[PDB]
From a paper:
In each case, the process of viral membrane fusion is mediated by the trimeric viral spike glycoprotein (S) that is cleaved into S1 and S2 subunits by multiple host proteases upon infection.
We observed various effects on neighboring residues for the D936Y, S940F, V1176F, A942S, and the Omicron triple mutant. These structural effects correlate with changes in fusion activities for these mutants —the D936Y and S940F mutations result in a loss of a salt bridge along with a decrease in fusion activity, the V1176F mutation on HR2 slightly displaces Q957 on HR1 along with a decrease in fusion activity, and the A942S mutation introduces an additional hydrogen bond along with an increase in fusion activity. Overall, none of the five single and the Omicron triple mutations dramatically altered the architecture of the HR1HR2 bundle, as indicated by the small RMSDs between the wild-type and the mutant structures.
Residue numbers in the entry:
A (entry chain C), C (entry chain B), F (entry chain A): 918 to 988
B (entry chain E), D (entry chain F), E (entry chain D): 1164 to 1200
């Protein structure tokens, strides 16, 4: 009787720990997906910002150049 | 001059509140699996 | 006697696994909060950068326009 | 004019797929530890 | 021209080192809960 | 015999839960490292962007100033 109680409680605990492990795996997978998406987003932003400040630098250089030509 | 468009750059959000709630629920329910001989 | 040993060891293990599950829940909650804050931060930065490069584009357009008026 | 260079700013990626796979593997293998008297 | 101020945009950091340390401590202490008949 | 079965199954389950806890600790550590690196990256980007738009504002101000001097 006590053995059946120990076995039932252990099976219940193993079921609950399986649920907890599945929940932890799902949470870690979602966090991985989101962190990787934000990493790709920051990298894309950094790249396109590099390009955009490059364009701004070029146009400001042309402005300053003809500018200088003016006076 | 037409600067590059960055308005599409978006960062997702994570919603693992279901899983955190399940973890706390299991940490509370494991007291129902303790053995009392 | 062996049943009491099994029961005590199982209760100790369930207590330690409860501590581990609480720690995992706390860690996942903190990671969720921080990842969401950084997501909102990147989104705010992207929005205000869009506005700021819009302003820069407008002022460079006005500069190039009157510029052109000069010569 | 020489604007600041930001090309070095990089964001790492995380690869915990091994650990998620191990967690699911253990959640599946714990059925081999159930007690069948 | 007054460009927008972005200096307030800040990203928090996470400090779950206590929880990782507790997880490893429990993974080490669970050897004291093994059954030796 | 049943006690030895319960003990063996419990030891196996505790070993597997130890493996799962080590995996969760490793995953949380990696996620912490990556989230903190991306936080430092976003902060560095915000700082250097502040400096860069400051420079752009200054040079556009000088342009508009001499510009105004022109006409």
């Amino acid at each position: 009787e006590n053995q059946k109680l120990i076995a039932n409680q252990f099976n219940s605990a193993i079921g609950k720990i399986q649920d907890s492990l599945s929940s932890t795996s799902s949470a870690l997978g979602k966090l991985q997906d989101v962190v990787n998406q934000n990493a790709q987003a920051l990298n894309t932003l950094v790249k396109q910002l590099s390009s955009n400040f490059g364009a701004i630098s070029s146009v400001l250089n042309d402005i300053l150049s003809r500018l200088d030509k003016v006076e | 001059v037409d600067l590059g468009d960055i308005s599409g750059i978006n960062a997702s959000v994570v919603n693992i509140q279901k899983e955190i709630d399940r973890l706390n629920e299991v940490a509370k329910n494991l007291n129902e699996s303790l053995i009392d001989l």
